[PDB]
Paper text:
A proteomic study has shown that MST1/2 interact with a specific PP2A complex called STRIPAK through the N-terminal forkhead associated (FHA) domain of the adaptor protein SLMAP. FHA domains are specific phospho-threonine (pT) binding modules. Like other FHA domains, SLMAP FHA adopts a typical β sandwich fold that consists of two large β sheets. One sheet contains six antiparallel strands: β2, β1, β11, β10, β7, and β8, while the other sheet contains five mixed parallel/antiparallel strands: β4, β3, β5, β6, and β9. The major structural differences between SLMAP FHA and other FHAs with known structures reside in the loops connecting the β strands, especially the long loop between β10 and β11, which forms a short β1’/β2’ hairpin and protrudes away from the FHA core. Despite the differences of the loops at the pT binding site among various FHA domains, the pT-binding residues, R32, S52 and H55, can be structurally overlaid with the corresponding residues from other FHAs, suggesting that the mode of pT recognition is highly conserved among FHA domains.
In mammals, the canonical Hippo pathway contains a core kinase cascade, formed by STE20-like MST1/2 kinases, Large Tumor Suppressor LATS1/2 kinases, the WW-domain containing scaffold protein Salvador (SAV1) and the adaptor protein MOB1. MST1/2 contain an N-terminal kinase domain and a C-terminal coiled-coil SARAH domain, which are separated by a flexible linker. MST1 and MST2 can each form a constitutive homodimer through the SARAH domain, and kinase activation is achieved by trans-autophosphorylation of the activation loop (T183 for MST1 and T180 for MST2). In this study, using a combination of biochemical, structural, and cell biological experiments, we establish the PP2A complex, STRIPAKSLMAP, as a key negative regulator of Hippo signaling in human cells, and show that SAV1 promotes MST1/2 activation through antagonizing the STRIPAKSLMAP PP2A phosphatase activity.
Author numbering: 2 to 139
Write the structure that this text describes.
Amino acid sequence: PSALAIFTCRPNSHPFQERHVYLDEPIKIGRSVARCRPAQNNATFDCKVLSRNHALVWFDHKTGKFYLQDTKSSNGTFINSQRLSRGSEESPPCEILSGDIIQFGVDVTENTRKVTHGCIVSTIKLFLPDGMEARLRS
């Protein structure tokens, strides 16, 4: 048994393939870098607007709650469009529920050229170690 977060790519997201992220321990969310590349079982994204150490997601095995924390991201982390912390500041742990829309970064139109870079926008579905779906967003 292992708690599980499934990340699926929303229509307004920079593209990524669906992730099946097991949460036996906290998982870093961050930008793809050497030695830390995207994989199905992780929350590492090839996306310009993410920080290397962007956020952290985990399951609290003693209460059955799931959490997301912004770890001083430059461009923001959001739960249902609400920003967890200011730029370059840490948030407290923020509880996430199954069905939340989670966003890392924001779209950025460069100031020096006409290019727009997308951000990661995901639905997250959350499952307890025994397989039952976690508390649902309402």
